[PDB]
Amino acid sequence: SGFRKMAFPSGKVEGCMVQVTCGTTTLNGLWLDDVVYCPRHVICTSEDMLNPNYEDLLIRKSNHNFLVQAGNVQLRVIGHSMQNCVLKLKVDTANPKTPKYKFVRIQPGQTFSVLACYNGSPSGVYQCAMRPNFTIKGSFLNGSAGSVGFNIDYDCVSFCYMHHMELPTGVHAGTDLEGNFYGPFVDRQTAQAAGTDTTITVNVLAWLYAAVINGDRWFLNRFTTTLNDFNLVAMKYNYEPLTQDHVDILGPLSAQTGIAVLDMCASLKELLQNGMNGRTILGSALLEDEFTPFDVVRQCSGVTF
Amino acid sequence: SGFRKMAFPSGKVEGCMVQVTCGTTTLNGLWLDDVVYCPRHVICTSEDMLNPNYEDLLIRKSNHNFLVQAGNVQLRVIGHSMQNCVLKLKVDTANPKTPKYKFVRIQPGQTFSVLACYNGSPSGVYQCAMRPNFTIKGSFLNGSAGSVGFNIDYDCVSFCYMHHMELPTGVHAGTDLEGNFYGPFVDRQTAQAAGTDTTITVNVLAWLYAAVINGDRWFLNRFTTTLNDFNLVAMKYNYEPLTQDHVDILGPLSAQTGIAVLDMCASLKELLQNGMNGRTILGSALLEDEFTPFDVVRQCSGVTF
Amino acid sequence: REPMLQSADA
Amino acid sequence: REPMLQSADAQ
């Protein structure tokens, strides 16, 4: 039993990480088949990153200007192209460690595993969630650009995120594997700010449903509430207002536990107003908000990932 | 100028629609490569729709029980399998009219073009939005299941919906192309009810941004409002509460017009509290909620396919 | 009324 | 402070 924030095994993703160097700027790249995906600002110098013209900067570079080091072997770049905010480096050798993969775009609230890399080598793996402000509260240092977020669905490796930059508040922004940023952020060092950091409410309710499945139910009550009354209370505590679809997302968890969503909403409303008061839920005093209802089913099933 | 619910050209999807017949049950099929996708309840008898044993029903069926007709040509089925609620029929000929495609899962509020089909032949095309209760307010009759919902991005046809059933209240439910239902619905004729249908607030604001771009700005005021204060008025009028991520979806529309999202929210509050007062917006007396911010950008840019 | 799987006959 | 792109200087 028990529930905890879990990331996917990163073995298949480690075999796809390479190092891409352009001039005096280096970062991580994703090697799938004969294409290497890396953030487009690798062609930027230290001074270009303020307000770069990437169309102008890309014409300055040729194929031999890109140094791609796969482990201890340099890959020969035979082609290059820019798709939105990512660079596509075509190499002469296909990656033999390429797993079954797909390029997907995740949504705010959903979770994925991040493999933090530096110099094309993996350094750590953690599970995070796309925050409501389209950022992620990760741990990234200099050179971590190109690190990918991913999920493992059966046989397929679903690449859904790729790191680019860090925002002034310490949160991080990135794009999908097609170069489209998550949120209103641009890959340049001009004035930018993320939205208000709020708590993913639907994931907190899933965390509470997992506690009931695990056996923790001291927070339940006989009371029910309306969607409007809970949202008026949740908004005062910087919680995201619950939408009708987010109620239907918790359907399977509501049917398994026999506790309606609006019933569990009265429990979370009491936990916010009265407070935790020195008691823990699932062995923790803080309410986890990066645990989707799909993560509850994954850890109930014991399925291999 | 002008803003209107517009569907993508259906020419590419027309070349993939086939008729799937199993006994006395006909359905529409999506013919991509050498696989024909169709709802799995085509193997169900007329009196076996209450609680069919889908696993037992598929075992009792062979490749000769499926009649796949592509216009005047009968495709021979050489294999069959089940992926969630979608049947996969392997055929001996790969569709040459197969376009560049991918299988995506949309979210509530997003739009897609529905190609209504009967007996494997296209009947009509129209734009639908995934309601907050995970339904669509389409126009489907008997034999329309298997009709697909899709969007076109660049040169790729993104399939996102497959019609399955009609709910008691007249709304329609379906799955993605992977077989996973949209919402807490099952392909069974047992007691089922959709959630409370509400107004997609982020789409109404996107519609207001479109009217502003079109020169219709009589509703614009000089007042501003907070995100919490707007949601209190919104949910009073059965509007969805505006989440933080949905504020960022209106980013490109807020940048193109220079009007802040919270400024457009205050204009919607005055429109809800005081009414239209015998006035119209974009030639419409009521506010539209099936127009995403992407639909606004798509119609003002005029991207061809 | 019950939900109806929208598959035609014959 | 200010947004920064999280590449690194080549060594």
Author numbering:
A (entry chain A), B (entry chain B): 1 to 305
C (entry chain D): 118 to 127
D (entry chain C): 256 to 266
According to the publication:
Given that Mpro processes the majority of these sites, any intervention that stops this process, such as an inhibitor, would block viral growth.
We used 12-mer peptides, P6-P6’ (with the scissile bond between P1 and P1'), in our co-crystal structures. We observed that the substrate peptide was extended along the Mpro active site with the scissile bond (P1 glutamine to P1’ residue) positioned between the catalytic dyad in all cocrystal structures. The N-terminal (or non-prime) side of the substrate had an antiparallel beta-strand conformation which was conserved in all structures, with the substrate residues and side chains well resolved. The binding mode of the C-terminal residues (prime side) was more varied, especially beyond P3’ position, and lacked full electron density. The sidechain of the conserved P1 glutamine was also extensively coordinated in another hydrogen bonding network.
